[PDB]
Design an enzyme around this catalytic site. Structure first.
Site, PDB file in Angstrom:
ATOM      1  N   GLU A  79      -0.069   2.043  10.587  1.00 45.42           N
ATOM      2  CA  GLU A  79       1.020   1.112  10.232  1.00 45.42           C
ATOM      3  C   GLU A  79       1.311   0.148  11.387  1.00 45.42           C
ATOM      4  OE1 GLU A  79       2.536   0.528   7.593  1.00 45.42           O
ATOM      5  OE2 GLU A  79       2.131   2.251   6.238  1.00 45.42           O
ATOM      6  N   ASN A  95       6.559  -9.346   4.383  1.00 44.88           N
ATOM      7  CA  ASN A  95       5.928  -9.099   3.081  1.00 44.88           C
ATOM      8  C   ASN A  95       6.136 -10.269   2.132  1.00 44.88           C
ATOM      9  OD1 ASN A  95       7.425  -5.970   3.723  1.00 44.88           O
ATOM     10  ND2 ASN A  95       5.228  -6.373   3.942  1.00 44.88           N
ATOM     11  N   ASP A 139       7.432 -10.400  -0.754  1.00 48.27           N
ATOM     12  CA  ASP A 139       8.741 -10.424  -1.428  1.00 48.27           C
ATOM     13  C   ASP A 139       9.875 -10.932  -0.526  1.00 48.27           C
ATOM     14  OD1 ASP A 139       9.202  -8.214   0.137  1.00 48.27           O
ATOM     15  OD2 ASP A 139       9.705  -6.805  -1.443  1.00 48.27           O
ATOM     16  N   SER A 184      10.876  -9.321   2.244  1.00 48.40           N
ATOM     17  CA  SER A 184      11.307  -8.195   3.080  1.00 48.40           C
ATOM     18  C   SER A 184      10.385  -8.176   4.306  1.00 48.40           C
ATOM     19  CB  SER A 184      11.177  -6.863   2.321  1.00 48.40           C
ATOM     20  OG  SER A 184       9.795  -6.596   2.055  1.00 48.40           O
ATOM     21  N   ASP A 208       8.726  -5.316   7.335  1.00 51.19           N
ATOM     22  CA  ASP A 208       8.512  -3.958   7.835  1.00 51.19           C
ATOM     23  C   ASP A 208       8.761  -3.885   9.339  1.00 51.19           C
ATOM     24  OD1 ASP A 208       7.654  -2.985   5.280  1.00 51.19           O
ATOM     25  OD2 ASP A 208       5.685  -3.743   5.668  1.00 51.19           O
ATOM     26  N   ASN A 240      10.683  -0.626   5.657  1.00 50.68           N
ATOM     27  CA  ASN A 240      10.909  -1.890   4.965  1.00 50.68           C
ATOM     28  C   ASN A 240      12.361  -2.227   4.672  1.00 50.68           C
ATOM     29  OD1 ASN A 240      10.946  -3.382   2.036  1.00 50.68           O
ATOM     30  ND2 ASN A 240       9.196  -4.032   3.279  1.00 50.68           N
ATOM     31  N   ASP A 278      12.519  10.745  -0.586  1.00 46.48           N
ATOM     32  CA  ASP A 278      12.904   9.878  -1.715  1.00 46.48           C
ATOM     33  C   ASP A 278      12.278  10.229  -3.080  1.00 46.48           C
ATOM     34  OD1 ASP A 278      12.379   6.546  -2.795  1.00 46.48           O
ATOM     35  OD2 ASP A 278      14.348   7.423  -2.625  1.00 46.48           O
TER      36      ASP A 278
END
Ligand code: CL
Ligand code: CL
Ligand code: NA
Length: 129
Positions: A35, A46, A48, A50, A52, A59, A101
């Site tokens: 990562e 990203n 969208d 957002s 990271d 995120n 989650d």
């Protein structure tokens, strides 16, 4: 801060990631390598809108506030900048929430694509743990 492999393994272990939700320590070290290349200051935007953040590329759509991801949540209740610190406490605390989650470590695309199903223990081999 750019961690060494064993240095990061040791910090992760101390913060209680080894076997957290059944994921052996090597999983977390492997996810961090792919990562962020073990860099706490890593950021990536990203499509969208957002971003990271940090050693585990957490995120802003869901997990942290950065003031620039409209419609997003802050489930870890932290500024995204906290995830960039040399001290990995915030990232680890938030990572524990993420992995809890529902999708486990599949929440990390690099883990699913580059760690899952491999010899993840190799990531902690040779380390004094
Ligand atoms: Cl926002
Ligand atoms: Cl799981
Ligand atoms: Na957010």
């Amino acid at each position: 801060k750019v961690f060494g492999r064993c240095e990061l393994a040791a910090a992760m272990k101390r913060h209680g990631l080894d076997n957290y939700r059944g994921y052996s320590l090597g999983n977390w070290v492997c996810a961090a390598k792919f990562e962020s290349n073990f860099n706490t200051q890593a950021t990536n935007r990203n499509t969208d809108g957002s971003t990271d953040y940090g050693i585990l590329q957490i995120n802003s759509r869901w997990w942290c506030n950065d003031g620039r991801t409209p419609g997003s949540r802050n489930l870890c209740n932290i500024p995204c900048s906290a995830l960039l610190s040399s001290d990995i406490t915030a990232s680890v605390n938030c990572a524990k929430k993420i992995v809890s989650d529902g999708n486990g470590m599949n929440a990390w695309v690099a883990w699913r694509n580059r760690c899952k199903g491999t010899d993840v223990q190799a990531w902690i081999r040779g380390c004094r743990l």
